[PDB]
Structure formats: structure tokens, C-alpha cells
């Protein structure tokens, strides 16, 4: 009788971390008998192809719904309906009635009337995509916008040719949903749900009825919010008997800030905790921040899912140091790199593998390049299999300044690779025992990292302990029953 809604802004075939998170929490409840199903608010036209694509990919388990805003009041008007809306399409071929065709490309077209010379139409084809422009007066007001001939969007454009209003239509051709866009910006207005003949003052007010809709107000619906930034679309729902929670997923004080700010949307999740059934934090370190700095009680430790696969086979006995992130500046990979000169220059032998993409991998290419450390240290760039890339490391790194756990360090550590890293806020500290399954370094110190590193890299026999002691540890301190466990508690409370 349990069932779970796991909210999040959107999920898209590029996006992870969080999503992948979510996606995992969803096959590990459902595997314990509570369908955990994902909630997105934003518009895609596209969305069963995005899905059906999550799903082959082994990303999205195949029992994981998505529900979405859009969606739902898309599928009430498709049966709501029997006939196609011939009048639109009608009113589309009339307005490009007197026109002559003038090609740029195959699909590409521009269309004149011919008794005036007026540029009445731009037309862009592509395969199962194809968009309308209209002008009046020289000038785009109108778009609409295709999928397999079908039209799905119009948007309303104005004089500084921003969009300044969106209808969405059915695979019939029906508006089901029209809206007004803050030209500026780019904000969601005035909202009308032309299906159910209700009118809204925002995005916002739109997802909180609808949550009101899909969700039934019973101890046993569960509602997980995901995205910190559609946390009001949960926490603003009439539900009173429905359980509400929040998971924080990073660290909650403003990244590369002296001033000692925290981030904007953590901090009303923190704030609201004690209104809710509770705000799950990663680890106890973060816990414990949270309840010195808030007036605030309600705060939970519930670390993520861990999926706990097979180690490899053989050890890594070559001087090979990996690193698998997302090239980003919280990760500091320029520091990886202060680091890997120090420890080249001490040693010859030991390599760098740094797999992932990002803003940073140009400004870390040519820092390798002033440092002349090709022959050492390596950009392999995207990889699809981190599990098969960490059998060829002896040990594995992290300069990284911010996280909420750090995945990709406990990802090591099941395949038998120990961490040497920054004890930062928050998760090194909860999973690394110093000395045992891997070294926590004091934050920044680029030297005793450097040291530390070459100690491990030239000892087969450290290097091996300290790979096994870190798979017995995620195994002992993350399995699947004591996570559970702990949901469950919060569900049954
Ligand atoms: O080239 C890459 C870069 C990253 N990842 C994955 O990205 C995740 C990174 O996790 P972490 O918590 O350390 O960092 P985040 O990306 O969430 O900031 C891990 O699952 C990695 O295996 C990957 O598959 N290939």
C-alpha cells in the first residue's frame, strides 16, 4: 500500500548524479516492494523518446514511471478526444496560401506572398522536427513547432522577438495548456489548463494543484523532493496526511565563499525541516553542521544507495593514479595537477589518468603543458564504463573542495582501490578510515597529498590492504538493508 513520488525539475539522457541517484533509490524500493517513481514539472515534447532512451541505456530501472506536469494533462485531452483538429492545420495552410518557396537548405524554406513580396513564413525541416515561423510586418510573432507533422507547441513571440506566451497541444492537435512568459527572463505567468477549464498565477501554483491531483492524501504517499528548486512545489501542497521530505544532495554552504553564505535553495529546505517529515543530509558530519547553525531539529542521515559490484580480478601493481569526475572547478583539478607535479618530480615512474569532460579540461590541458608533464599525466576524456577503467588503477584521488558523500570515491573503494583525499565538507571523513582503507588529507595541503601518494603508488602490499579494507567498509558501513532500514523508520513513523 506504500507508494513513493521522487521529485526533480527534469530528467534528460545527459543529466547525472542526482537523477542517477534517484534512479537507483526507485529500483532498490521497488526491489523492497514500494514503487518510487520520478515526478519532473518542465515541458519537453520529446519526453517518451527521453525515457525510452534511460531505459535501454540501464540508467532508468524499466519499472520507474515518470509523471509529469505536462504529460498528465496531455494524456486526459488525448482521450478527451476522437478527431484530429483539422481547423488548425487548415488555418496553417491558408495563411501560406499565395507564397512562393525560396530554399536555403532541404528542409530550410522561405515563403513570400506573391501579389505583395511580404516575408510571410520560415520553415526549418529536420527528419521528425519541423518549425513554422510567421511574420507580420517584417517581423517573427508567431511559432509552431512539429514532431512527425504533428504540432505540439505555438509560442507567441514580441516586438524584441522574445517569446512572450506558449500553447501546448495534444497528438490530436488539441490545446490542452496555454501560458504567459516574462519576456526578460524567461519566467512561467499566467497559466490556464484549458482541459480541466482551470486558470493558475504560475508554474508554481500550477505543480502544487497537480501534485494535489496525482498524489492521494494517505500516510502511506510518499513524497522525496530531489531538485532543491521545485522543493516549494512540494512543500506548498494542501496534503495533510501524505508524508513530505527533502534530500539534500550537496554541501549546504555557498561554493568558493569567504563570506560564509549558504546556498539559497538548501537553506529554505534547512529552514522548513521541523514543518516537514523530516530533510535527509548525506552524511553525519553534515547533520551535526546543520543542527549548530539552525534552529532546526528534523534533519536526517540517510547516506545513498550504494550498488556493490564485484571487485576485479587483479590488483593494479603499476603506478597508475586515477581520477573520474565531471571536469568541473569544485573537483580542483588544477590542484590535482600541483599535486601530480609534486609527485612526478620525486618519482618518473607513476602515470595520471583523468577521465571525464567539463569547463575546466582546456584550462587543465594547458596547465599540463606549462607544468611539461605530458609524458605523466593524462586527459582520457568521457568514459561510459568507470567500473572497467578502475581495474587499471593502483589507487585512486580526490582534490575536490565541495561534495555532499563523493560517489565516485566510494565507487574506488568497492572495486578495491583506495582514496587518497582532501578531508572536506562533506564525505571523505565518513568512509575513508586514515591509515586503514586510505588517507584523509588535510585540505589543500598539496604536499603531505603528494606524499602520501607515493607512499601508497610504491607499496603493492599497502596498496592491496588498503583496496580490500575499502570494500569491506562500504559493504559493512552502506548496505542496502541499513539504508532501507532507515526510509522505512521515517515512513513508519
Ligand atoms: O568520465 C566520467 C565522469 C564521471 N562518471 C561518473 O560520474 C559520477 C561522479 O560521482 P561524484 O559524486 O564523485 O561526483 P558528481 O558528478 O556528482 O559531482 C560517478 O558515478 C562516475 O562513475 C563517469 O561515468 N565517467
Redesign the pocket.
Known amino acids: 500500500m506504500k507508494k513513493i513520488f521522487m521529485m526533480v525539475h527534469e530528467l534528460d539522457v545527459n543529466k ?3 537523477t ?2 534517484m534512479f537507483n533509490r526507485s529500483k532498490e524500493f521497488y526491489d523492497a516492494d514500494i514503487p518510487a517513481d520520478i515526478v519532473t514539472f518542465d515541458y519537453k515534447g520529446n519526453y517518451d523518446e527521453i525515457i525510452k532512451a534511460l531505459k535501454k541505456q540501464g540508467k532508468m530501472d524499466r519499472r520507474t514511471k515518470m509523471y509529469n506536469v505536462f504529460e498528465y494533462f496531455k494524456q486526459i485531452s488525448n482521450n478527451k478526444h476522437f478527431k484530429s483538429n483539422k481547423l488548425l492545420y487548415k488555418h496553417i495552410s491558408e495563411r501560406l496560401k499565395n507564397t512562393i518557396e525560396i530554399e536555403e537548405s532541404k528542409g530550410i524554406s522561405r515563403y513570400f506572398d506573391i501579389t505583395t513580396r511580404t516575408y510571410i513564413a520560415y520553415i526549418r525541416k529536420s527528419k521528425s522536427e519541423k518549425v513554422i515561423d510567421f511574420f507580420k510586418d517584417n517581423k517573427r510573432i508567431e511559432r509552431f513547432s512539429f514532431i512527425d507533422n504533428k504540432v505540439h507547441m505555438k509560442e507567441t513571440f514580441n516586438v524584441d522577438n522574445k517569446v512572450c506566451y506558449q500553447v501546448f497541444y495534444d497528438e490530436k492537435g488539441y490545446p490542452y495548456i496555454s501560458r504567459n512568459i516574462n519576456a526578460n527572463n524567461g519566467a512561467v505567468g499566467k497559466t490556464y489548463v484549458l482541459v480541466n477549464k482551470k486558470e493558475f498565477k504560475n508554474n508554481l501554483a500550477l505543480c502544487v494543484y497537480y501534485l494535489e491531483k496525482l498524489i492521494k492524501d494517505s500516510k502511506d504517499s510518499i513524497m522525496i523532493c530531489d531538485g532543491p528548486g521545485s522543493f516549494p512545489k512540494m512543500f506548498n501542497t494542501n496534503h495533510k496526511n501524505a508524508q513530505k521530505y527533502g534530500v539534500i ?1 550537496v554541501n549546504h554552504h555557498e561554493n568558493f565563499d569567504d563570506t560564509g553564505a549558504f546556498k539559497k535553495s538548501e537553506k529554505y529546505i534547512i529552514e522548513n525541516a521541523n514543518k516537514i517529515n523530516g530533510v535527509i543530509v548525506l552524511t553525519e558530519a553534515q547533520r551535526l553542521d546543520i543542527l549548530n547553525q539552525f534552529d532546526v531539529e528534523n534533519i536526517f542521515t540517510i547516506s545513498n544507495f550504494v550498488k556493490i559490484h564485484n571487485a576485479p580480478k587483479h590488483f593494479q601493481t603499476e603506478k597508475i593514479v586515477g581520477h ?5 572547478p ?2 580542483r583539478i588544477d590542484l590535482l595537477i600541483e599535486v601530480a607535479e609534486l609527485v612526478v618530480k620525486k618519482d618518473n615512474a607513476v602515470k595520471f589518468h583523468i ?3 567539463g569547463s575546466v579540461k582546456d584550462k587543465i590541458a594547458k596547465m599540463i603543458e606549462d607544468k611539461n608533464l605530458e609524458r605523466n599525466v593524462f586527459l ?8 572497467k ?1 578502475l581495474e587499471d588503477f593502483k589507487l585512486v584521488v ?1 582534490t ?1 573542495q565541495y ?9 574506488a573503494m568497492i572495486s578495491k582501490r583506495p582514496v587518497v583525499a582532501f578531508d572536506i565538507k562533506y ?1 571523505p571523513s565518513d568512509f575513508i578510515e586514515d591509515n586503514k582503507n586510505g588517507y584523509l588529507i588535510e585540505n589543500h595541503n598539496i604536499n603531505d597529498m603528494a606524499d602520501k601518494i607515493l607512499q601508497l603508488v610504491n607499496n603493492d602490499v599497502l596498496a592491496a590492504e588498503f583496496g580490500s579494507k575499502a570494500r569491506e567498509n562500504i559493504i559493512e558501513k552502506y548496505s542496502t538493508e541499513s539504508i532501507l532500514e532507515k526510509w522505512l523508520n521515517l515512513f513508519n513513523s
Open positions: 547525472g548524479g542526482m542517477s541517484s544532495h573520474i569526475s565531471r571536469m568541473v569544485t573537483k577521465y571525464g569532460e582520457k576524456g568521457y568514459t561510459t564504463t568507470p567500473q577503467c580526490s575536490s561534495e555532499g558523500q563523493g560517489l565516485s570515491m566510494i565507487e564525505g
